[PDB]
Structures are given as structure tokens and as C-alpha cells.
Amino acid sequence: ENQTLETILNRKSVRKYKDRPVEKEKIDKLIRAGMAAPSSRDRRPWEFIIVTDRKALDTMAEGLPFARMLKETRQAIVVCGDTIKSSNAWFLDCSAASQNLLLAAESMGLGAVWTAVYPYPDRIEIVRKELRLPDHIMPLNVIPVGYPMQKETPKNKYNVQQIHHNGW
Amino acid sequence: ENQTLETILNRKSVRKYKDRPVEKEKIDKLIRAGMAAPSSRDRRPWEFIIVTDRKALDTMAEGLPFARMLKETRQAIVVCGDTIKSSNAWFLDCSAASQNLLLAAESMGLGAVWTAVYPYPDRIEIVRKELRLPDHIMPLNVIPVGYPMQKETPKNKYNVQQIHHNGW
Numbered sequence A, B: 001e002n003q004t005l006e007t008i009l010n011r012k013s014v015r016k017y018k019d020r021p022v023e024k025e026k027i028d029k030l031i032r033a034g035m036a037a038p039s040s041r042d043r044r045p046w047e048f049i050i051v052t053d054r055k056a057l058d059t060m061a062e063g064l065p066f067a068r069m070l071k072e073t074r075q076a077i078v079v080c081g082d083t084i085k086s087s088n089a090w091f092l093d094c095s096a097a098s099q100n101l102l103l104a105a106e107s108m109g110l111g112a113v114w115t116a117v118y119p120y121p122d123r124i125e126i127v128r129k130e131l132r133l134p135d136h137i138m139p140l141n142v143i144p145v146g147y148p149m150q151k152e153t154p155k156n157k158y159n160v161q162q163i164h165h166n167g168w
């Protein structure tokens, strides 16, 4: 039995949460998981914003068409990249960090969903505004987290036709 | 005890391998792990090239910087994205897929490393011409896989200065 592989295969996007907040110890483990990502030339260009402010969460919800569930959580994490530290890899490093965070969540009985910010200038504008992100800090995503309100089922995405040998 | 977190925190880039091939069933599980990634609009734009041809591995080892370990493995997995399927987010989706693949490797006692291809045009061209990739298919990386030659140490990347509360 491989519990890591099981978490990987059972992870799903969770968009509905119980009312209760997530414990600070669990939030910190989510962050620590993200920071364990690999990183081009080990620059470590990620920055994590833990957002619990009701007004900010609601304002972002009301400006992000595919992130309306921000109104229905008490906490979200915004993964950002520092474009001075890694102008050609922050979006790769931070995507790997994001995936660690989502797996960490699944592993601790939490629900989470990756909602895009970058590369959409309208989404970037509101997130940068509400969180006072400096010009060299680019928000990749908003990740609401919470205890799942119901049983959710993973997608089975295996497709042998997306496997190739020695060339296309 | 959280085995998934344990794997996340103990993953490291492994660049030195036992001179022996990896079981096909393990390679398949790597790819299944990759395919389980989240995907913008569920467009699943990933394509995986399993590379066992010696000349292909050696040619990429020669042409790519920081890719010398390709000479020392029997097999590598090249993660690619279909830009017609996901023109704005393929490389984000494919980075999440890549991180699943790396974690899967670590969980099965294998060693792996992300070697950079995207976003460097000269690197992209090497991989494209070696693997006969159609123009709408972009190579993200090359991931050599093997049994680790030696015990390797993970990095502790935790830094509280990269954690922010309610904004920058």
C-alpha cells in the first residue's frame, strides 16, 4: 500500500465547506508543504498570503467570476511568485508548490480548490489591490480551504492515448 | 502519522542512479500520478513521452544544460502540453502533473529530478526535434527516473518570512 499515491489519486477540487475555521496548525502544514516544492536554481521565489479578513475575502469573491466560493470560507491561501527572484520559473515553482499544498490538504481531511489569478489581468488587478501586493509579486492563484461539507469523488483522468514512447 | 506529508517533505532532486532500469509498472504509476493533477477548465492538456532510446537520452544530455544525468539513466519522462487544448494555462497544469510525478517517484523509492526545458527556446527546440513533437505540443521538462545511487538529503526550505497575513 502506498498512501502518497492514494492521496494523489483521490485529490479533488472542493468548492463547498463546513462553517468551521481550519486550525492554525493545519494552515501552517499546508504552507510548509508548499515550500517543500522543487525550485529552478533553488531560488525559492514563492510567497504565501493567508487571508482570513472577511471584507477582503468577500471583495475578491465579488470580483472573481470563478472564485465565488471565497464568500463561503473563513480562509484562503494566495500563492504568489517573486518575478525579480525568478522571472523565467516562478510560475513553474509556484505551480509545484500549489500542488504540494492541495495534496497536503487532501491528506489532512481538508478540501481546497486552485482558482486561477495569473495569467488574467482582471483577476490579477483585484487580488493585487485587495492584498496590497508589490509590483514584483505576482499572484498565481487563490486557494480557498475548509472542511468539506459533503462526500466528494475524484475524477479518473487516466488516458493511455496521452502516453507516447520515444517520440510523439 | 501522515505519510503523504512525509513524502512531500522528504522529496529531493536525485541526479545519480544505480545502473539498472526501472520496472514498467512503476513508470506507469508515475504517469497515472501525473494525469491526476488539477487542470484549468479540466482541459487535461498533458502528454507524456517515455524515453528509453539511448541516442535520444544522450542527445538531450548533450544539448540541454544541467541535464547530464540523462546519460546515466535508462529512462526519462518528458512532460508536454497541448497548446490548442489549453493556450493560456497548459504549463501550469503540466507543472502540477510534474509535481505529482516527482512525489510518486519518491513514494516508490525512486529518484527523479525536474530538468528545465520550458521556457527556453533553444532547449524547447532540442527536445522538439529529438522527439518529433508537433508544433502545437510544447515540452515542459525532462524527468530522468532511477533507483538512487546513494542516500540523499532533503532541503528544509521553511521560511516564516515568506508567510504573510491578510496582505503583503
Ligand SMILES: Cc1cc2nc3c(=O)[nH]c(=O)nc-3n(C[C@H](O)[C@H](O)[C@H](O)COP(=O)(O)O)c2cc1C
Pocket: A036, A037, A038, A039, A040, A041, A042, A089, A092, A093, A096, B011, B012, B013, B014, B015, B065, B066, B067, B113, B114, B115, B116, B154, B155
Ligand atoms: C522549474 C524547475 C527547473 C529545474 N531545472 C533543473 C535542471 O535543469 N537541472 C537540474 O539538475 N535540476 C533542475 N531543477 C531542480 C532544482 O535544482 C531543485 O528543485 C532545487 O535545487 C531544490 O532542491 P530539491 O529538489 O532537492 O528540493 C529544476 C527544478 C524546477 C522546479
Ligand SMILES: Cc1cc2nc3c(=O)[nH]c(=O)nc-3n(C[C@H](O)[C@H](O)[C@H](O)COP(=O)(O)O)c2cc1C
Pocket: A011, A012, A013, A014, A015, A066, A067, A113, A114, A115, A116, A154, A155, B036, B037, B038, B039, B040, B041, B042, B089, B092, B093, B096
Ligand atoms: C491553472 C488552474 C486554474 C484553475 N482555475 C479555476 C478557477 O478559476 N475556478 C475554479 O473553480 N476551479 C479552477 N481550477 C480547478 C479545475 O476546475 C479542476 O482542477 C478541474 O475541473 C479538475 O477537477 P479536480 O481538481 O477535482 O480533479 C483550476 C485548476 C488549475 C490547475
Ligand SMILES: [Cl-]
Pocket: B022, B023, B024, B025
Ligand atoms: Cl518491467
